[PDB]
Nucleic acid binder design. Structure first.
Ligand code: MG
Ligand code: MG
Ligand code: MG
Ligand code: MG
Ligand code: MG
Ligand code: MG
Ligand code: MG
Ligand code: MG
Ligand code: MG
Ligand code: MG
Ligand code: MG
Ligand code: MG
Ligand code: MG
Ligand code: MG
Ligand code: MG
Ligand code: MG
Ligand code: MG
Ligand code: MG
Ligand code: MG
Ligand code: MG
Ligand code: MG
Ligand code: MG
Ligand code: MG
Ligand code: MG
Ligand code: MG
Ligand code: MG
Ligand code: MG
Ligand code: MG
Ligand code: MG
Ligand code: MG
Ligand code: MG
Ligand code: MG
Ligand code: MG
Ligand code: MG
Ligand code: MG
Ligand code: MG
Ligand code: MG
Ligand code: MG
Ligand code: MG
Ligand code: MG
Ligand code: MG
Ligand code: MG
Ligand code: MG
Ligand code: MG
Ligand code: MG
Ligand code: MG
Ligand code: MG
Lengths: 56, 120, 122, 209, 114
RNA sequence: AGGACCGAACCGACUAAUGUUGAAAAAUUAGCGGAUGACUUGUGGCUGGGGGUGAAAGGCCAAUCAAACCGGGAGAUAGCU
RNA sequence: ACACAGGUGGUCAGGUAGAGAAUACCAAGGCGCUUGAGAGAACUCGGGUGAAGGAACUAGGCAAAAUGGUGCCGUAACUUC
RNA sequence: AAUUCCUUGUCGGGUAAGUUCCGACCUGCACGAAUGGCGUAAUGAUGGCCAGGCUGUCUCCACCCGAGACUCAGUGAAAU
RNA sequence: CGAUGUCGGCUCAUCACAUCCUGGGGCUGAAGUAGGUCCCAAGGGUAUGGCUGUUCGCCAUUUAAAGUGGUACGCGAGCUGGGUUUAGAACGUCGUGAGACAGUUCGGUCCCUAUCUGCCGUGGGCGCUGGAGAACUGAGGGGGGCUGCUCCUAGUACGAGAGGACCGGAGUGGACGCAUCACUGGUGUUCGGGUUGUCAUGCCAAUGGCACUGCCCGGUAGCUAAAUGCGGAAGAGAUAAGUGCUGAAAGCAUCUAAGCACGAAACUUGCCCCGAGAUGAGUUCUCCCUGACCCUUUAAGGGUCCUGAAGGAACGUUGAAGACGACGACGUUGAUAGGCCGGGUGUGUAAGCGCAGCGAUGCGUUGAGCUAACCGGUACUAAUGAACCGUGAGGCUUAACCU
C-alpha cells in the first residue's frame, strides 16, 4: 500500500492540475453606496439591495 | 438517500438539537437580530416562526405550549405581548435570513437572521 | 414463512403434539413454505397410544400460518400459531379424521377435498 | 403503433366486482403535439418528434422557440422522438392524444429510475454479506475477493462493484392497461412504473407481447 | 394528487359505518364456492383501524375453535358487506395489539356506553 | 467460626470487539474471578551474574535473560557476506 | 520522549430513592476535554428496533438476546451428612 | 481411555441423519497399582456433549441514531 | 531462503468441455413409460443439513440436475484461525538422561491510510474547423437466455395384461434479475401518548432536562422486504451432429463432387441499457453576429477604438438529484424552498374550570388538543437591477449547377 517507484514532478503537477484556484471576478455595485461586494451578501457597513439592513 | 426527509442534523445529538434550537430561539426573541451560519439560520427559521404563529392567540393553554418550547417566561412574556401584536395582520414569513460573510476561524458562511419590521 | 427447523403444531386426530419441518418440498433451494404447500416433517412429541410415534418422518400440509395468507382483495387471514395436518408419505390421504383448528379456503384444490370436508370452520 | 409521453402521477387500486384489487398506476397524458415528421427521404429513417407540457415565456430559449414556431405550437417541456413502425404518415403540429390507447391492451413504460445514490455491492448486486460475528473483523458488509491471483493478474472488465444505482433509464414491460380515460386524460396500467411521482414515462404499446 | 383523489372517490362506497376501535364488529364477506356467491359471516373485536381513504383497512380478532384468527378487511371493497356493530367498547389505545397475548378472561374488554 | 456465599473499593487479567505508522513500545469499552485472606498495599532494608529469587515458566533481576548492564582484553575470530 | 484515553499512597466525602462508598438525578465546587463549519454516499466503528422461523450460524451458541430484587411456598439424584 | 495404530472397531442410547458424546464387550499396536491404581460429595473465567429458554448468530438482511469517511478554512505527517 | 505465508470454511467469482440437467439426433438385447451408449452443444442453471478442523466421504431429506477440473490444487495489502510446524502441560511408547514421536490431547498476538496497473462510478480541459441550443441515426459493447408440476389432446397411440406417450396448446409454482410502495408488514432517537427515579420551573397544578430514545406502546413521509407487478420467449437468417432429394466419378449404388431442401437453449438478430473522443469525432431542425482604421520581412499576421449577440457560466432558493463536481426545476413577467391556511394521517377525550368522592381517580366540556419531511392553495420571507465569459458572416484546392 506504500509506493513502488517515485513519481515525477510531471505527475505531481498533473495531479495539481485541478487543484487550481478560481476567483469570483464578477461583483455587484449596490444601488445606494455602490461599494462592490458579493451577490446576495451585505456590504461592510450594512447596506444590501440599496438599503441599510444592519439597522445600526 | 434521505428522499423527502426535511430536517437538518447539524452534526449533533438529537438531544443537543432540541436544546440548541431552544436557547438560540431564546436569544433571537430577547434580541431582534442575531448572527450565525446559514444552516443554523435556515433551521432556526423553522422553530421561531412556529412561535410567532402560536402567540397570535393568547390563552392559558397557549402559554403552556409556548413554555414547554423555549422554557423561559421572559421569552413567553416577550411573545404574546410584543410579537403576536407586531406580526398580526401579516400571514407568513415572520423572520428573514440575510447572508453576510465568513468567520476568520473556520470559514463558515454566515448570515444575519432577523425578525421583520425593525424600523422602530 | 414455514421453513426448515420450524416447530409446527399438529391439527388432526393422529397423535402428535410438536412436529418440526425438515424440508420444504417443491423445488430446488426452496426457502419457505406457505399456504397449502406439502412439506416433510419429523415428529418430536406424541400422545402415548396414538397412531404415529416419536422420531418418525412423514409428510404434511400447512394449514394455519402465523404470517397469514393473502386473499385477492388485499386482505389477510393472519392466524396465531403454526399448525399442520399429517399425511401418508406415499399418497395424499391424510392420516387424521378429526381435523381441529379452522383452516383456509385456499386449500380447496381437489387433492385436499377431504381436508376441507372434515374441517370445522372456513 | 408508435407511443406517447406521459407523466407518472401516483398509483392506486381499482376494484373489480369480484373484489380483485387491481394495483394501477395513473399516467397523466395531456396530448403529444408533434413537432417534426422525420423522413427516410430527408434523414434516413421515419420518426415523429413529439412534445407535451407547458413552458414559460422567459424560459423557452431562442433556438427552440423557432423550432416550435416552425410548425406552430405552444411550447412543451422538452422533446421526445418515436420511430414509426410501418407507413404511418402524419402532419406537423398534429395532436396525438390518448385515444390511440383505446385499442391496444398490452403496453410498455420507459422512464428514469428513482436515484438510489452510491449503492454498495450488497444493495446494488445482491452480494450475500459475510458473518456479523464468529471472529469477523472489519469485513461485515464487504465484497470480499475481487479476482483470482497472478494468472489473470488483473480484475476483469465488468466486475460487479459499488457505484451508481438508479437515476437511469428503465423499461418495465408488458403492463396490462386497465382503463383509458378520455376527458380526464389518464391511463391506468397494472402495477408499477419506474421513477418517483412526476417523473416522465415514455409509454408505448408492448412490442413483444 | 388532485387527479388521484378524484379517482380515489369513484371506487369508494358512500355508506361505510364509522366506529371507534374496540367495537365488537360482525362483518359479512362474499365467499365464492364454485359458482355460488355465498354470503359469509365473521365476528370479533376490532383490533386496529387504518384510515387511508380508499386504502382503508381494519383488523378483527376472532377467538375461533383453534388458537385465534385475525382478519383484516379492505374497507371499501366489493367483498365486505356488513360493518354492523354489536358492542361498543372502551379502550384507551388506538390499536389493540396487546390482545394477541391476553387470553380468555384477561382479553375481555369493557362496553363503552357513555 | 469459616483459605464460607453474593457483591463495590483494592488486586488480578478469562472472552470478544476496537486498536495494532494505536490515545497507549500491552491499553480502552461491554462482560469476568478473588474480594477477612496462602490477601492486598505504603515506606525503609537484605539477597547479585554462573550468582540471586522462584506455589517452578528455564519465568523475573530497570521496556533487555537457557545466563543483566557498563568499561577493558579488542581493530577477538570469521575457510562467510 | 509530548499539554499522552495509562500508573500513583493516605484523609474529608452532603440531599432524594436504595441493603450499600452499588447506581441514578442533583448540592458545594470544578469543567465542556486546544481544531471547527457543512453535507447526510458506499463502507468502518459504538448502539437501537424488527415480520415468520428460532442455531437452520459455526471449529464452538463466539457474540448478542435472555434471566436478574425482596417476602413466601416449594425443592431430586447422590453425599464425606 | 488426556492411553486403541488398525478404526469413524462392534452392540446399545440420544437424532430425520451423530468420525464427537454416554453405557458396555475385551483382539490392552503400546493401562496398572505412591514417576500411585480405582472411585468420589463439593468446587472450577476447565475439556467434550445434550435439552429448555432466548434472541439478527443464520435463512436474507432492512431501517434508524451518533463518531470517521466525503466538502471547505487552518496546521500538516509516515512506511516507501 | 537481505521472506514465495499453509489446508479447510465465508465471500466473489471466471474459463475449459473429457456435459450432471434442459435442447437436437443415430443405434439398441428401443413395444409403451423408464433406461443403456455414442455424437453435436457451454446459453443458463448446477442442494439444505447430522458427524469431522477436514476437502473427501457416510447418512437423512429433496431436486430437472445437485458435473468434472484449471485458475499460487483462484481468493489472508478481503475475513476467520478450527487443523498444522513457537514458547506451557499430560498420557502411550522410546532412551541412563536432556528430550523425542507421518501417535495424541487442552491452551495459544493473523500487521499496512493504495503511488502505479486493473476494475466500479463520476466530472474538468480540449478537440470535433463560425458559435450555440435540442432531438436522433448508429459502429462497437454489455445485460438477459433456468425449469417443474397439473390439465386438455387421451387415460387415445402402443400393450395379452400391468401400465402408459411424442407433438401441440393453456394454467399454476420454485430459483434469479429488474422495478415500485397502491396493498400487507418492518424501521421510523424530527410526531402523539403512558410511566419509574430525581432536579428544576418560587409552590399546587401543569411541563422541561437527565438516566442507551430511561424504559415502553403505537405511528406520517421516506427507505425496504417477507409485499406487489414484470421478465426469459415467439419469429427470422445462417449452421453443428444428423436426416433426405436429384446424381455422376464407378452404366448400378450413393446426402456431395456441381445444385437444392430441412435441421439445437449454441452463432448473428429480435427484447433492454450504454453509446459520435466511432479522432472514420455523423445527421436533421432552429437561433444569433452581415463595425471602422493603421502597420507589415504584406502572411489563414499583429494591434486599436466601437459593439461584445444567441447562449453559457457564476451566484441564489432547492429536488423523490447527489460523496464532491454534475444533472433537473425556479429566480417576482415568481410556486423553488421556508412560513401561513384548509384538508388528511397519526396519537388519542389536552389545558383550565365545574360536578361526584375523605382520596387516588372518574365523568362533563371533547374523537378534543397537539400534529415531522404528506396533498391542494397563497408571495408573507428569500431567489437585487447588473455584471463575467463568449463575437463582428466563418480558410485552401477542385468539381458540379446558377450567370
Ligand atoms: Mg487536489
Ligand atoms: Mg465533523
Ligand atoms: Mg438523551
Ligand atoms: Mg485484530
Ligand atoms: Mg468487580
Ligand atoms: Mg563478569
Ligand atoms: Mg587478544
Ligand atoms: Mg491535552
Ligand atoms: Mg494523563
Ligand atoms: Mg449516597
Ligand atoms: Mg454549581
Ligand atoms: Mg450515518
Ligand atoms: Mg436488538
Ligand atoms: Mg457469554
Ligand atoms: Mg446484554
Ligand atoms: Mg453407533
Ligand atoms: Mg500391558
Ligand atoms: Mg502411568
Ligand atoms: Mg513404578
Ligand atoms: Mg495423580
Ligand atoms: Mg466428584
Ligand atoms: Mg480456581
Ligand atoms: Mg446439535
Ligand atoms: Mg482540508
Ligand atoms: Mg425411449
Ligand atoms: Mg453447515
Ligand atoms: Mg456436505
Ligand atoms: Mg484462504
Ligand atoms: Mg484474539
Ligand atoms: Mg450495435
Ligand atoms: Mg449481443
Ligand atoms: Mg388397446
Ligand atoms: Mg400422465
Ligand atoms: Mg406500519
Ligand atoms: Mg418505535
Ligand atoms: Mg416522546
Ligand atoms: Mg409536581
Ligand atoms: Mg440539568
Ligand atoms: Mg433495561
Ligand atoms: Mg412499529
Ligand atoms: Mg476531419
Ligand atoms: Mg443559463
Ligand atoms: Mg399565483
Ligand atoms: Mg413550500
Ligand atoms: Mg377526560
Ligand atoms: Mg401531556
Ligand atoms: Mg396543523
Amino acid at each position: 500500500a506504500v509506493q513502488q517507484n517515485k513519481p515525477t514532478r510531471s505527475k505531481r503537477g498533473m495531479r495539481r492540475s485541478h487543484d487550481a484556484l478560481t476567483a469570483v471576478t464578477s461583483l455587484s455595485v449596490d444601488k445606494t453606496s455602490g461599494e462592490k461586494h458579493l451577490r446576495h451578501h451585505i456590504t461592510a457597513d450594512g447596506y444590501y439591495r440599496g438599503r441599510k439592513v444592519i439597522a445600526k | 438517500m434521505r428522499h423527502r426527509k426535511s430536517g437538518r442534523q447539524l452534526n449533533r445529538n438529537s438531544s443537543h438539537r432540541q436544546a440548541m434550537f431552544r436557547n438560540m430561539a431564546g436569544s433571537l426573541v430577547r434580541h431582534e437580530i442575531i448572527k450565525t451560519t446559514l444552516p443554523k439560520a435556515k433551521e432556526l427559521r423553522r422553530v421561531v416562526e412556529p412561535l410567532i404563529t402560536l402567540a397570535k392567540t393568547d390563552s392559558v393553554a397557549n402559554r403552556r405550549l409556548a413554555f414547554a418550547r423555549t422554557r423561559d417566561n421572559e421569552i413567553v412574556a416577550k411573545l404574546f405581548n410584543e410579537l403576536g401584536p407586531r406580526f398580526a395582520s401579516r400571514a407568513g414569513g415572520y423572520t428573514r435570513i440575510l447572508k453576510c460573510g465568513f468567520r476568520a476561524g473556520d470559514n463558515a458562511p454566515m448570515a444575519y437572521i432577523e425578525l421583520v419590521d425593525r424600523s422602530e | 414463512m414455514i421453513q426448515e427447523q420450524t416447530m409446527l403444531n399438529v391439527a388432526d386426530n393422529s397423535g402428535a403434539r410438536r412436529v418440526m419441518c425438515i424440508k420444504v418440498l417443491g423445488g430446488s433451494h426452496r426457502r419457505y413454505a406457505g399456504v397449502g404447500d406439502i412439506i416433510k416433517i419429523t415428529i418430536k412429541e406424541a400422545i402415548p397410544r396414538g397412531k404415529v410415534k416419536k422420531g418418525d418422518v412423514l409428510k404434511a400440509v400447512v394449514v394455519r400460518t402465523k404470517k397469514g395468507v393473502r386473499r385477492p382483495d388485499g386482505s389477510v387471514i393472519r392466524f396465531d400459531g403454526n399448525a399442520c395436518v399429517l399425511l401418508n408419505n406415499n399418497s395424499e390421504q391424510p392420516i387424521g379424521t378429526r381435523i381441529f383448528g379452522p383452516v383456509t379456503r385456499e386449500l380447496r384444490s381437489e387433492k385436499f377435498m377431504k381436508i376441507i370436508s372434515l374441517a370445522p370452520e372456513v | 403503433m408508435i407511443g406517447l409521453v406521459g407523466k407518472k402521477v401516483g398509483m392506486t387500486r381499482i376494484f373489480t366486482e369480484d373484489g380483485v384489487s387491481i394495483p394501477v398506476t395513473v399516467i397523466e397524458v395531456e396530448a403529444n403535439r408533434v413537432t417534426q415528421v422525420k423522413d427516410l427521404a430527408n434523414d434516413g429513417y421515419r420518426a415523429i418528434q413529439v412534445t407535451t407540457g407547458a413552458k414559460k415565456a422567459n424560459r423557452v430559449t431562442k433556438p427552440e422557440a423557432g423550432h416550435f414556431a416552425k410548425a406552430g405550437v405552444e411550447a412543451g417541456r422538452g422533446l421526445w422522438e418515436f420511430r414509426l413502425a410501418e407507413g404511418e404518415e402524419f402532419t406537423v403540429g398534429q395532436s396525438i392524444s390518448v385515444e390511440l390507447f383505446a385499442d391496444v391492451k398490452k403496453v410498455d413504460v420507459t422512464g428514469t429510475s428513482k436515484g438510489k445514490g452510491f449503492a454498495g455491492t450488497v444493495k446494488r448486486w445482491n452480494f450475500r454479506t459475510q458473518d456479523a460475528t464468529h471472529g469477523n473483523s472489519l469485513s461485515h458488509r464487504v465484497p470480499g475477493s475481487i479476482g483470482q491471483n497472478q494468472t489473470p493478474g488483473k480484475v476483469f472488465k465488468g466486475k460487479k462493484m459499488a457505484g451508481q444505482m438508479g437515476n437511469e433509464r428503465v423499461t418495465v414491460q408488458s403492463l396490462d392497461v386497465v382503463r383509458v380515460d378520455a376527458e380526464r386524460n389518464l391511463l391506468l396500467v397494472k402495477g408499477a412504473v419506474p421513477g418517483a411521482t412526476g417523473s416522465d414515462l415514455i409509454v408505448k404499446p408492448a412490442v413483444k407481447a | 394528487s388532485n387527479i388521484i383523489k378524484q379517482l380515489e372517490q369513484e371506487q369508494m362506497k358512500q355508506d361505510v359505518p364509522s366506529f371507534r376501535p374496540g367495537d365488537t364488529v360482525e362483518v359479512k364477506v362474499w365467499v365464492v364456492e364454485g359458482s355460488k356467491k355465498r354470503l359469509q359471516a365473521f365476528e370479533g373485536v376490532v383490533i386496529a383501524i387504518r384510515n387511508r381513504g380508499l386504502h382503508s383497512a381494519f383488523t378483527v380478532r376472532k377467538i375461533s375453535n383453534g388458537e385465534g384468527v385475525e382478519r383484516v378487511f379492505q374497507t371499501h371493497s366489493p367483498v365486505v358487506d356488513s360493518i354492523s356493530v354489536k358492542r361498543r367498547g372502551a379502550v384507551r389505545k388506538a390499536k389493540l395489539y396487546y390482545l394477541r397475548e391476553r387470553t380468555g378472561k384477561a382479553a375481555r374488554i369493557k362496553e363503552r356506553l357513555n
